[PDB]
C-alpha cells in the first residue's frame, strides 16, 4: 500500500521517477489540508511536498481530503484570565486525486461537501471537480528540440471518470501540437484538442494553449505544459462546455517506447 507510505514515509531518492510535488494551489496560506488513506493521515500546508515517489506512476491515487482553517476564540476562564479556545472550521471535504508521471504530476479535487450559506458550522453537500497543482520539471521553451515529431499518450480524467484516453502530438519543427480525448463516459467530453503553437510563459517554460473542439465546434479550451529536459511528458487541464454546464478535465501524457 503505497498511499500510507506517501502519507507517513519521508522523501527518497531511490523512489521511482517523480519524487516530490509541491502543494501550492491545493492549499492556501493559513489552511490545513488533511489527507487520509490506508489508515494513515497527514496534514499539509502551503509549501509542503507530497511524497509522490511512493505512489504508482500513470495511475490516479485517491485520498480522502478535508480542508480546515483554525480559529482561536476569546473566552474568560474561571478567573478573569484570557483563554483562547482553538476551533477548526471545516472549509471543504471530498476526494483528493493525484496523477503521477516521471517528470510531472497533477492533483485534482473532487469536492463533496462545503460550508453553508452564512456558514454557522453547517455543512451542505455541493459537488465540484477542479484541478489543484500541476508541477514537474518544466521544459524550457528555449531548449526545445529543433525538429522531429513526438506522440504523447496518456490519461484524461474528470468527475467520477478516470478512464479517458489522451493522445497528443507535437511537431517541433512547426512548434505546434494537437490531440484528442477518447473513451470518457460523458460523450460531450470526448473532444479534439485543436492545433495551437508552443509559447513561452512568464518563467519561459514551454506551454500550449488551444481550443477544445466537439465536432469541429469550439466548446472550451485546454492548457498543457511540456515537462522533461527532452520534452518527455505533457501535463495540464481542459475546460469543456456540456449540457450539464462546464466540466474540468485533468490531462497527462508521456511518450512511449
Ligand atoms: Cl471583568
Ligand atoms: Cl463539476
Residue numbers in the entry: 79 to 150, 150A, 150B, 150C, 150D, 150E, 150F, 150G, ...
Q: Could you give the paper's own sentences about this structure?
A:
The recombinant subunit vaccines Bexsero and Trumenba contain an important meningococcal antigen, factor H binding protein (fHbp), which is a lipoprotein composed of two β-barrels that tightly bind domains 6 and 7 of human complement factor H (CFH). fHbp is antigenically variable; databases of genome sequences contain more than 900 different fHbp peptides, which fall into three variant groups or two subfamilies: V1 (subfamily B), V2 and V3 (both subfamily A). Here we use structure-based design to generate chimeric antigens (ChAs) against serogroup B N. meningitidis. ChAs exploit fHbp as a molecular scaffold to present the surface-exposed PorA VR2 loop, which is achieved by inserting the VR2 loop into a β-turn region in fHbp. ChAs retain epitopes from both fHbp and PorA, and can elicit functional immune responses against both antigens.
The resulting ChAs were named according to a scheme whereby fHbpV1.1:PorA151/P1.16 denotes fHbp V1.1 with VR2 P1.16 inserted in the place of fHbp residue 151. We determined the atomic structures of ChAs with VR2 P1.16 inserted into position 151, 294, or 309, all of which generated PorA-dependent SBA titres. These structures were solved using molecular replacement to resolutions of 2.9 Å for fHbpV1.4:PorA151/P1.16, 3.7 Å for fHbpV1.1:PorA294/P1.16 and 2.6 Å for fHbpV1.4:PorA309/P1.16. All ChA scaffolds align with good agreement (route-mean-square deviations (RMSDs) range between 0.447 and 0.614) to fHbp V1.1, demonstrating that the fHbp scaffold is not perturbed by insertion of VR2 P1.16. In each structure VR2 P1.16 adopts a β-turn conformation that extends away from the fHbp scaffold. In ChAs, the VR2 N- and C-termini are effectively locked into a 'biological' β-turn peptide mimic by neighbouring fHbp β-strands, as confirmed by our atomic structures. We constructed five different ChAs, in which a VR2 peptide was inserted into position 151 in V1.4 or position 158 in V3.45. SBA titres were detected with antisera raised against fHbpV1.1:PorA294/P1.16 when alum was used as the adjuvant, and with antisera raised against fHbpV1.1:PorA151/P1.16 (a low level of SBA from a single mouse), or fHbpV1.1:PorA309/P1.16 when MPLA was the adjuvant. However, significant IgG1 binding to PorA on the surface of H44/76ΔfHbp was observed only with antisera raised against fHbpV1.1:PorA294/P1.16, fHbpV1.1:PorA117/P1.16, fHbpV1.1:PorA183/P1.16 or fHbpV1.1:PorA309/P1.16 with alum (p ≤ 0.01 by two-way ANOVA), and fHbpV1.1:PorA151/P1.16 or fHbpV1.1:PorA294/P1.16 with MPLA (p ≤ 0.0001 by two-way ANOVA).
